[PDB]
């Protein structure tokens, strides 16, 4: 690895993320986007499922 | 799902279980997903 090499010979750091689903409860979840809370109105609420 | 419920109670009885009511709060749910059929308590020795 030299800094003057071509782009086909320059070092590339590769991270491969492997996602599997097994019968155990899935615990690595994405961030759950939260809508700001609105009170005193007839709204459709979704609290923790 | 592995449910661990627990309760701490202050007692002063010497030998047996005291007679009373104490509901156990849920402490922690563990995503283990494994088969369990046997268990064993872990103790601590005292060395001198
Ligand atoms: C769980 O373990 C017991 C005893 O080892 C066995 O009889 C049973 O079939 C197992 N169940 C599963 C789903 O592996």
Curated annotation (Swiss-Prot), chain B:
Glycans are attached at residue 35. Changing residue 14 to E: In strain: Omicron/XBB.1.5, Omicron/EG.5.1. Changing residue 35 to Q: Increased resistance to neutralizing antibodies. Binds to host ACE2. RBD also interacts with the N-linked glycan on 'Asn-90' of ACE2. Cleavage of S generates a polybasic C-terminal sequence on S1 that binds to host Neuropilin-1 (NRP1) and Neuropilin-2 (NRP2) receptors. Interacts with host integrin alpha-5/beta-1 (ITGA5:ITGB1) and with ACE2 in complex with integrin alpha-5/beta-1 (ITGA5:ITGB1). May interact via cytoplasmic c-terminus with M protein. May interact (via N-terminus) with host bilirubin and biliverdin, thereby preventing antibody binding to the SARS-CoV-2 spike NTD via an allosteric mechanism. Attaches the virion to the cell membrane by interacting with host receptor, initiating the infection. The major receptor is host ACE2. When S2/S2' has been cleaved, binding to the receptor triggers direct fusion at the cell membrane. When S2/S2' has not been cleaved, binding to the receptor results in internalization of the virus by endocytosis using host TFRC and GRM2 and leading to fusion of the virion membrane with the host endosomal membrane. Alternatively, may use NRP1/NRP2 and integrin as entry receptors. This is Spike protein S1. The gene is S. The chain holds residues 200 to 247 of 1273 of the full protein.
């Amino acid at each position: 690895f030299q800094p003057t090499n071509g782009v086909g010979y320059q070092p590339y750091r590769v991270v491969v993320l492997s996602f599997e689903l097994l019968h155990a409860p899935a615990t690595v979840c994405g961030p759950k986007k939260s809508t700001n809370l609105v009170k005193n109105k007839c709204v459709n609420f979704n609290f923790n499922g | 799902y592995f449910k661990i419920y627990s309760k701490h109670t202050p007692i002063n009885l010497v030998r047996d279980l005291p007679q009373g009511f104490s509901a156990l709060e849920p402490l922690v749910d563990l995503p283990i997903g494994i088969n369990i059929t046997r268990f064993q308590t872990l103790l601590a020795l005292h060395r001198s």
